[PDB]
């Protein structure tokens, strides 16, 4: 876990009247860059004559996922997604198959 907070800064105390104790209004921004390496295994060799199944991209409830589209061009009913849509299935791999 990476914990972040802004260091609180005290407001003025001294000859000014009625100040009380205050903190400076401060917020922080920045860029979080995350690099992750994954180890990848090779594909298993295929003995089949017939093609493997297609690695289809997943299907959206309306139109197509992961593409910005104009929802007024399509009869899909996912206007609440404003033309950028997730698939309705989770995209799972395992489309290609090998014997046991």
């Amino acid at each position: 876990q990476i914990f972040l907070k802004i260091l609180p800064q005290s407001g003025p105390i001294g000859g000014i009247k009625s100040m009380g104790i205050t903190t400076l209004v401060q917020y922080a921004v920045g860029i979080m860059t995350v690099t992750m390496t994954f180890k990848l295994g090779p594909r298993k060799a295929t003995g089949r004559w017939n093609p493997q199944p297609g690695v289809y991209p997943p299907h959206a409830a309306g139109h197509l996922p992961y593409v910005l589209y104009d929802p007024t061009a399509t009869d899909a009913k996912q206007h609440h997604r404003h033309g950028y849509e997730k698939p309705e299935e989770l995209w799972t791999a395992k489309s290609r198959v090998h014997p046991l």
């Binding site: 991209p57 139109h63 197509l64 910005l68 589209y69 104009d70 007024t72 061009a73």
Partner: protein, 241 residues
């Protein structure tokens, strides 16, 4: 009390100092076998309040295109300097055509320098006032790989200003992509909807440089070998030889 109490005095805000030297580089240097042409323009990139990607999707229904066009508009700007008269003053172009038999492009360098990301805020008494930002960043993405749809060199009204006294306002990057023509219900009018082939490019998904105020970055490009344009004409008709 007020600083106005002295009538020949002005208030002072005690701003910062920055003893940098930079060049305004302009002019053609001719040589026997080449000319090096440099121009500089100030450019301005506007405040964009919402960095939306938008689908460019007009309807079709007088000559239309063969199918309705569809594309994407991005929050990015790009630089267009694809015109010869940017590189030569009128005198230098006269000198080129007076003294040389042919011309070909050889090499290009683009330098962005004197970057200032400028904060804006309300001015006293109304209007706005501008200050230089130390945390503002100009994103520069140079697409050496030609990943992104190439829109330069289309005769569009996007060029750098012809005079060096004018500020370049670089065009918003937008491009057209393939798609599927979908009939708009009973009307029979058509729109191109996105399809699996439609290329949606998000430039923020690539790596690009973040340049602070005072930042400089340079692109360099070499042209391939190309046939030179012949600057000299013919004193004979080929059919009268």
């Amino acid at each position: 009390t007020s600083v106005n109490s002295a009538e020949a005095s002005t208030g002072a805000g005690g701003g910062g100092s920055n003893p940098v030297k930079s060049m305004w580089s302009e002019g053609a240097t001719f040589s026997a076998n080449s000319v090096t042409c440099t121009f500089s323009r100030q450019f301005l990139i506007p405040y964009d309040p919402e960095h939306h990607y938008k689908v460019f999707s007009p309807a079709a229904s007088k000559v239309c295109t063969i199918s309705p066009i569809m594309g994407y508009s991005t929050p990015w700007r790009y630089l267009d300097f694809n015109a010869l008269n940017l590189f030569f003053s009128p005198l230098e172009f006269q000198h080129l055509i007076e003294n040389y038999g042919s011309i070909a492009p050889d090499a290009l360098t683009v330098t962005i320098s004197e970057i200032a990301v400028k904060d804006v805020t309300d001015k006293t008494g109304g209007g706005v006032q501008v200050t230089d930002s130390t945390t503002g960043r100009l994103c520069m993405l140079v697409d050496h790989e030609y990943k992104y749809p190439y829109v330069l060199g289309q005769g569009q009204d996007t060029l750098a200003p012809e005079l060096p006294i004018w500020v370049y306002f670089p065009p918003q990057y937008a491009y057209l992509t393939v798609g599927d023509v979908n009939t708009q219900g009973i009307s029979g009018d058509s729109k191109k909807l996105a399809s699996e082939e439609s290329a949606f490019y998000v430039l923020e998904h690539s790596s690009f440089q973040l340049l602070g105020t005072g930042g400089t970055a340079t692109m360099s490009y070499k042209f391939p070998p190309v046939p030179p344009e012949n600057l000299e004409g013919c004193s004979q008709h080929f059919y009268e030889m």
